[PDB]
Design a binder for these strands. Structure first.
Ligand SMILES: [Mg+2]
Ligand SMILES: [Mg+2]
Ligand SMILES: [Mg+2]
Ligand SMILES: [Mg+2]
Ligand SMILES: [Mg+2]
Ligand SMILES: [Mg+2]
Ligand SMILES: [Mg+2]
Ligand SMILES: [Mg+2]
Ligand SMILES: [Mg+2]
Ligand SMILES: [Mg+2]
Ligand SMILES: [Mg+2]
Ligand SMILES: [Mg+2]
Ligand SMILES: [Mg+2]
Ligand SMILES: [Mg+2]
Ligand SMILES: [Mg+2]
Ligand SMILES: [Mg+2]
Ligand SMILES: [Mg+2]
Ligand SMILES: [Mg+2]
Ligand SMILES: [Mg+2]
Ligand SMILES: [Mg+2]
Ligand SMILES: [Mg+2]
Ligand SMILES: [Mg+2]
Ligand SMILES: [Mg+2]
Ligand SMILES: [Mg+2]
Ligand SMILES: [Mg+2]
Ligand SMILES: [Mg+2]
Ligand SMILES: [Mg+2]
Ligand SMILES: [Mg+2]
Ligand SMILES: [Mg+2]
Ligand SMILES: [Mg+2]
Ligand SMILES: [Mg+2]
Ligand SMILES: [Mg+2]
Ligand SMILES: [Mg+2]
Ligand SMILES: [Mg+2]
Ligand SMILES: [Mg+2]
Ligand SMILES: [Mg+2]
Ligand SMILES: [Mg+2]
Ligand SMILES: [Mg+2]
Ligand SMILES: [Mg+2]
Ligand SMILES: [Mg+2]
Ligand SMILES: [Mg+2]
Ligand SMILES: [Mg+2]
Ligand SMILES: [Zn+2]
Lengths: 127, 140, 211, 100, 224, 83, 100, 115
RNA sequence: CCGCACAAGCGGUGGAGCAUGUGGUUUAAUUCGAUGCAACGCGAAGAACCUUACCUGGUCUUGACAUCCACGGAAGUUUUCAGAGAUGAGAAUGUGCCUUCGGGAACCGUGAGACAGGUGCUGCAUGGCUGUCGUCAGCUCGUGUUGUGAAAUGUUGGGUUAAGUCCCGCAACGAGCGCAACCCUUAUCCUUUGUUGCCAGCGGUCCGGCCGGGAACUCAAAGGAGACUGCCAGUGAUAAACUGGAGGAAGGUGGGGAUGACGUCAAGUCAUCAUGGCCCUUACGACCAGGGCUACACACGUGCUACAAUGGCGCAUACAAAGAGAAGCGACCUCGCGAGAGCAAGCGGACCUCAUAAAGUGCGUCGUAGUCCGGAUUGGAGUCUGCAACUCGACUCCAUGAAGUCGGAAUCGCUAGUAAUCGUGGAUCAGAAUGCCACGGUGAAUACGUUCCCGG
């Protein structure tokens, strides 16, 4: 038996496999802390298990690529949420109330002509 | 604005302590999007505060802030076609925001060897009601 | 308030291109130059034949040219006597074997270009401009039963100060992209200078894509 | 662009084409690491004698249609103006306004 | 229809004395409770003559148009007309119905065009929103023109519930010269009604009596 | 500047002129337009009239100038002060 | 054993898919064994030019060219197949490359 | 500690200290330390006298301060008297290697004064 | 009745050095155009020669560039002298090809004219193209209707919107150009195909998806599905519409782009090109070398880097996107402190190369200083492109360490993946990006409100 989830955030994407186990996790063949110096990312990724108190019952195998550390973290969180819904759909209601189910769509905006940044324009001459 | 008005934006709770107020604090302290630097500074300052001033960390922070919160300001409205320098009671959100802004602005000035140290000193004084954010309240 | 080119926007939506040959960077620029020379020749020779458009292809190292005119007989000649000369000369300048095909424009009134060239000719013969506009427009409405607009500007009637007048009938929904707007312009020289002419001819709505 | 300009350009391209090989060989000699000093000296001296316009560097791209010396694109060999109008005609295969 | 039936139906009601209308005094029954009253015995002969005229018109297959703009009467006029297969207006009277019918013809054309698309079901070709949009537009057109889409031209004669509230239709009728059969009441002028039907224009029971009598007259006359 | 693998640079015609002059001992100035050539030691004691866009400027060569470009001793712009 | 690999490029996606349609149906009716048409990432160039004869720095437009790719692989080049697929020809707009 | 004639390096990382010598940048400073075989980060204090002596001998290899200044002066004087373009723009106190002068020459021209 | 118009917030400009444009001055020359906004990193997506239109000097006169006639010779190749070069003078040389067998086609030279040539003038003679009000919500017609007419209604009124968007009322009913929609792009799922892309479950492995194998997953690119106030509650004149809630990847134009109504400014461009017409033909046309467009008491606009411990320096170690490549991109290995050099594989490119992202994180150090901040300027010594880097290129090493410690009056930008901050790619291009056009990483604050400034 096994269950799967796919997550995305900014330019990143992640594949998540979840299985009954004592709670060990690996990301790109590295431990979570080895893959993330910043202390925030670790909760950011573990919050779904905390929310349903599953932390010690499922083992995780993770592969992720694209985007930065923050985007990856978000992608993994989303993937874990989906994986959990596959495992037990009754979790859907509380997972949505937590806001974990929603696909954040915010992405960078393209530069435009005459603007040295998206919505940034040179100082007025004031003549 | 002329056509419309809208509510303020939601923010996450602090991931270490679960308080949104502390997250707002780190945001006002943040510069150039270096959030990790700001949060390291804030965590170290609160840690040294708890071990040297007060009994507990988040509680020490909250009491130091409470010793400072302004209630009233004179910032203007003009509906009559002429400017009002009218004293008006302040919403709690703005109370906290003004207090936080003032304390960080003072820490920038205090001038100790490091920002975590400046911040801890200002905050310890604020818990002692001597942190000059009290003065920034009092002048208003 | 300058407007965009009606044909350009609708390319790849309802309008197909006039040149559909593939090439790589090592050949693109000179392919384009050869196409330019070919058209620049054919227009000069076929001025009298009332030619509308020329579409060029380069399949299998050979150039194939298709011409749309309102009256083939003038260009095709007796027993293909003269078209053969065109084939030879285009083969020469293109540097490849050449193939020519003729398509017959059936309603010259509803062709933007032909209308414009008629107007330019009439102007060059000092026919009063607005009369020509009126007759052109009314003919368009009689046959095509869909909107038309005409624009003329320059030193009209030899007036000291140049100016522009224009005329419309029916729907001309430019901002719409489904609209099968036919657009073109033409030129007329006079003793006084240049008088431009532009024409739009709506012909209905396309639903289901150019496919 | 005055006719003289395009005349100069065509003359440069032709003449430069002519002496391509000889210049290449003498460059090979001049740059060689182990060449005798006297040989390199002679080669350098002799290079001067060739017509200056022989060097490819002196050429300037100009619009095929008009010969404008600015706003050139190698892809089409045309200036920013003529390429734009020709595009609007739709004579360039597969070119379309970009909205991404 | 007789005088006491009319009284029971409230045909004799009028309006409370109101300013500046001494024109109606001739033939006023009277007044009570500060409201004027109509003479039903003028009505009986006039009303019967109106019905006789309508019977004659129906016998020659005249196209009666039933216009009701007085609120309560709009659905009743629709019922009466459709019972008779006749055309009707049950909304605000669009000014220029007759004088500007030239324009109305095009609305009829486009109504039928969209209806034909409906039978075709080709709205499915469109993007979902535009399909719904065309459907809604068709719904509005049906709502407005449904009662006249089959009329095909200017009608022969007009039935009017109340001169006091359809007065624009009276103006157009006079302009073109189309006979008007209408209820005429206190606070209303017989001017512009060719075959006046004296009687109260307000009471819904009176309206019911009028409409029943008129529809019966139409079908009896066209059936002789 | 010029690579050392390349070696110094000089225009041929100038070389022939200076060689002929020095072997002849004519010792009178040499009109030239070659601002871009480099001074070799054997040219010491000569005089070169170097074109400056307008006029050929006399110049007397001495050992300190060896290795300099000829043009470096003939200013092309003029200036005497805005005021 | 042998294997034929064919790469197709064009600017009209529909046109090139049609091309693949003919190629594959011929490979079938001739009885060869085929790997299905594999799409490959499509390149797109973009250009921009000032639209005004007398310049306004702000005023410029943008254009792009899209070139699509399809790939087909034949792992059973039966003899009659080999020549047959060189008997086929495609529209002008389609560029074909075959290799063994 | 006194080195290279009259220099008295302050007590800091030996490298930062030595740079004080006019003519000794960071690179030369590391070179000297490496040659002397001394750790770069030791204070200028707690050197034995012999260690400072080996450092004196080390620095004796490079051009001492006074002769370095003299050689700079002689080079510039040679350019000045040679009368070449670079000498002219030295004597006129203007940028010497091709910078624009319609603007942006204050470091060479000095602070602004009215025309 | 509204808008980053003000207010509320954040960060800059105005002081310093330097890059760049303009004005003035200067010069033989500093070629020309552009001027409130809506000129000033602007035409120019790239001036050492060339470019180049300016200056000095040296040369040609049917001509550099095109047709027409005559005459003479294939062409072309190699090479010598004079001259800065343009050119001039010579040498050998070629000596050919179709030839109906006449010659001709080829080219090249001289002569004769008709003509060539012009970045010369007029954007107030014009076409074409573009900016501006302004992505502002308006601009009009037909039929009908009212006034003796000049005209008016529609298009005003009460609501409601981003909107002349929609509902009600209403002497008006409609229509057209605008608005919205149809197009590209992004957010979720489904179908199809699986190499050069993919590796969940299997077998082997030196542990390298490395290879046997797999068609799951990511991803690739074609076609589908999906959001409409559809559902619920309240509100409202039962109107439209508004407020909240459910579900859902996404909720009320989901987000961004393209798309610019009638007209205003005799706005800009005769130097892209086209053209009316006026002017110059041994010269206002043409060729060549050197100079200049880069000057310098000045001052104005737009930028880049700083004045530092939220930092500087040393060591170790993570995570992208989007592009380009055939005279091209160029690995590997060897040499140099370094820019680089030698050798040389691969790839027309999901395969090969450019090319290891920086902020980040771990360790140490510096201790508030004109500093282990800052880097301008100058001396010495080198590499690379190019015939050639003096005027006048970029880059490397050593040495040298200005001014500058948060900046007046006053003023500019920004409402969310935005501001701020950190890197990568591309065009022009032998060489020459602090400019321009794109790509991603991290990632905020504030908005009472409309009165004042401002503009519909
Ligand atoms: Mg919800
Ligand atoms: Mg436009
Ligand atoms: Mg060049
Ligand atoms: Mg040097
Ligand atoms: Mg700009
Ligand atoms: Mg309005
Ligand atoms: Mg403000
Ligand atoms: Mg400044
Ligand atoms: Mg100043
Ligand atoms: Mg100028
Ligand atoms: Mg010579
Ligand atoms: Mg002659
Ligand atoms: Mg002229
Ligand atoms: Mg002007
Ligand atoms: Mg103008
Ligand atoms: Mg003007
Ligand atoms: Mg209006
Ligand atoms: Mg709008
Ligand atoms: Mg509308
Ligand atoms: Mg109305
Ligand atoms: Mg295995
Ligand atoms: Mg599959
Ligand atoms: Mg799709
Ligand atoms: Mg929607
Ligand atoms: Mg909701
Ligand atoms: Mg949109
Ligand atoms: Mg959308
Ligand atoms: Mg639109
Ligand atoms: Mg001019
Ligand atoms: Mg020159
Ligand atoms: Mg300039
Ligand atoms: Mg430093
Ligand atoms: Mg990478
Ligand atoms: Mg490049
Ligand atoms: Mg090495
Ligand atoms: Mg590529
Ligand atoms: Mg690179
Ligand atoms: Mg670091
Ligand atoms: Mg140094
Ligand atoms: Mg200082
Ligand atoms: Mg940057
Ligand atoms: Mg960014
Ligand atoms: Zn009544």
């Amino acid at each position: 038996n096994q269950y799967y989830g796919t997550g995305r955030r900014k330019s990143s994407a992640a594949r998540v496999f979840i299985k009954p186990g004592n709670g060990k996790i690996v990301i790109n063949q590295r431990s979570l802390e080895q893959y993330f110096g910043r202390e925030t990312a670790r909760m950011v990724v573990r919050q779904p298990l905390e929310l349903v108190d599953m932390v010690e019952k499922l083992d995780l195998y993770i592969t992720v690529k694209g985007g930065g550390i923050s985007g990856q973290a978000g992608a993994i969180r989303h993937g874990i949420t989906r994986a959990l819904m596959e495992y037990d759909e009754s979790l859907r209601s509380e997972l949505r109330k937590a806001g974990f189910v929603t696909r954040d769509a915010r992405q960078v905006e393209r530069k435009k002509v005459g603007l040295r940044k998206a919505r940034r324009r040179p100082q007025f001459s004031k003549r | 604005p002329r056509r419309r008005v809208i509510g303020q934006r939601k923010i996450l709770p602090d991931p270490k302590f679960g308080s949104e107020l502390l997250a707002k604090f780190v945001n006002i302290l943040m510069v150039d999007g270096k959030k990790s630097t700001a949060e390291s500074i804030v965590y170290s300052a609160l840690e040294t505060l708890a071990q040297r001033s007060g009994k507990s960390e988040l509680e020490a922070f909250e009491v130091a802030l409470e010793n400072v919160r302004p209630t009233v300001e004179v910032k203007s409205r003009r509906v009559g076609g002429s400017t009002y320098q009218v004293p008006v009671e302040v919403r709690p959100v703005r109370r906290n925001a003004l207090a936080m802004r003032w304390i960080v602005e003072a820490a920038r000035k205090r001038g100790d060897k490091s920002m975590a140290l400046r911040l801890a000193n200002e905050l310890s004084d604020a818990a002692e009601n001597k942190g000059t954010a009290v003065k920034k309240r009092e002048d208003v | 308030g300058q407007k965009v080119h009606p044909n350009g926007i609708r390319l790849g939506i309802v309008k197909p291109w006039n040149s559909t040959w593939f090439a790589n960077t090592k050949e693109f620029a000179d392919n384009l130059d050869s196409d330019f020379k070919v058209r620049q020749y054919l227009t000069k020779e076929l001025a009298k034949a009332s030619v509308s458009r020329i579409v060029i292809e380069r399949p299998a190292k050979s150039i194939r040219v298709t011409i749309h005119t309102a009256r083939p007989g003038i260009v095709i000649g007796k027993k293909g006597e003269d078209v053969e000369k065109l084939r030879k000369v285009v083969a020469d300048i293109a540097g490849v074997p050449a193939q020519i095909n003729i398509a017959e424009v059936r309603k010259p009134e509803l062709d933007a270009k032909l209308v414009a060239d008629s107007i330019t000719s009439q102007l060059e013969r000092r026919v009063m401009f607005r009369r020509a506009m009126k007759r052109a427009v009314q003919n368009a409405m009689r046959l095509g039963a869909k909107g038309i607009k005409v624009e003329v500007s320059g030193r009209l009637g030899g007036a000291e100060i140049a100016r522009t007048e224009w005329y419309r009938e029916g729907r001309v929904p430019l901002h719409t992209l489904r609209a099968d707007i036919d657009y073109n312009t033409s030129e007329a020289h006079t003793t006084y200078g240049v008088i431009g002419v532009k024409v739009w001819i709506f012909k209905g709505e396309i639903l289901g894509g150019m496919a | 662009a005055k006719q003289s300009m395009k005349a100069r350009e065509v003359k440069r391209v032709a003449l430069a084409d002519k002496y391509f090989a000889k210049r290449a060989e003498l460059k090979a000699i001049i740059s060689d690491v182990n060449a005798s000093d006297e040989d390199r000296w002679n080669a350098v001296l002799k290079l001067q004698t060739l017509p200056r316009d022989s060097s490819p560097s002196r050429q300037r791209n100009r619009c095929r249609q008009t010969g404008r010396p600015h706003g050139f694109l190698r892809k089409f060999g045309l200036s920013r103006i003529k390429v734009r109008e020709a595009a609007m005609r739709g004579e360039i295969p597969g070119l379309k306004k970009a909205s991404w | 229809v007789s005088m006491r039936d009319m009284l029971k139906a409230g045909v004799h009601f009028g309006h409370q004395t109101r300013y500046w209308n001494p024109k109606m005094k001739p033939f006023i029954f009277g007044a009570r409770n500060k409201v004027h009253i109509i003479n039903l015995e003028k009505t009986v002969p006039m009303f019967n003559e109106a019905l006789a005229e309508l019977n004659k018109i129906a016998s020659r297959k005249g196209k009666i148009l039933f216009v009701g703009t007085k609120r309560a009467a709009s659905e009743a006029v629709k019922d009466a007309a459709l019972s008779c297969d006749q055309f009707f207006v049950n909304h605000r009277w669009l000014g220029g119905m007759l004088t500007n019918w030239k324009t109305v013809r095009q609305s009829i054309k486009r109504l039928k065009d969209l209806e034909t698309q409906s039978q075709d079901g080709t709205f499915d070709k469109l993007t979902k929103k535009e399909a719904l949009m065309r459907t809604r537009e068709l719904e509005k057109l049906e709502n407005s023109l449904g009662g006249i889409k089959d009329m095909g031209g200017l009608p022969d004669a007009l039935f009017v519930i109340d001169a006091d509230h359809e007065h624009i239709a009276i103006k157009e009728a006079n302009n073109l010269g189309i006979p008007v059969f209408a209820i005429v009441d206190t606070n209303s002028d017989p001017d512009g009604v060719d075959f006046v039907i004296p009687g109260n224009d307000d009471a819904i029971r009176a309206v019911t009596l009028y409409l029943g009598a008129v529809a019966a007259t139409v079908r009896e006359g066209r059936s002789q | 500047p010029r690579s050392l693998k390349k070696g110094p640079f000089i225009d041929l015609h100038l070389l022939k002129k200076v060689e002929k002059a020095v072997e002849s001992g004519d010792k009178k100035p040499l009109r030239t337009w070659s601002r871009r050539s480099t001074i070799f030691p054997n040219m010491i004691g000569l005089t070169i009239a170097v074109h400056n866009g307008r006029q050929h400027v006399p110049v007397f060569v001495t050992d300190e100038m060896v290795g300099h470009k000829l043009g470096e001793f003939a200013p092309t712009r003029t200036y005497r002060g805005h005021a | 054993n042998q294997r034929i690999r064919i790469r197709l490029k064009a600017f009209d996606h529909r046109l090139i898919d049609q091309a693949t349609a003919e190629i594959v149906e011929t490979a079938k009716r001739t009885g060869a064994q085929v790997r299905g048409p594999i799409p490959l990432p499509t390149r797109k160039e973009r250009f921009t030019v000032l639209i005004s004869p007398h310049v306004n720095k702000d005023a410029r437009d943008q254009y792009e060219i899209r070139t699509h790719l399809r790939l087909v692989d034949i792992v059973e080049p039966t003899e009659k197949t080999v020549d047959a697929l060189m008997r086929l020809d495609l529209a002008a707009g389609v560029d074909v490359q075959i290799s063994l | 500690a006194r080195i290279a004639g009259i220099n008295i390096p302050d007590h800091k990382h030996a490298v930062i200290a030595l740079t004080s010598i006019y003519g000794v940048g960071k690179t030369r400073s590391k070179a000297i330390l490496a040659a002397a075989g001394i750790a770069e980060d030791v204070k200028i204090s707690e050197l034995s006298e012999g260690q400072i002596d080996t450092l004196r001998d080390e620095v004796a290899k490079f051009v001492v301060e006074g002769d370095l200044r003299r050689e700079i002066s002689m080079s510039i004087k040679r350019l000045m008297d040679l009368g070449c373009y670079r000498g002219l723009r030295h004597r006129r106190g203007l940028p010497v290697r091709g910078q624009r002068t319609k603007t942006n020459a204050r470091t060479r021209k000095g602070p602004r004064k009215p025309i």
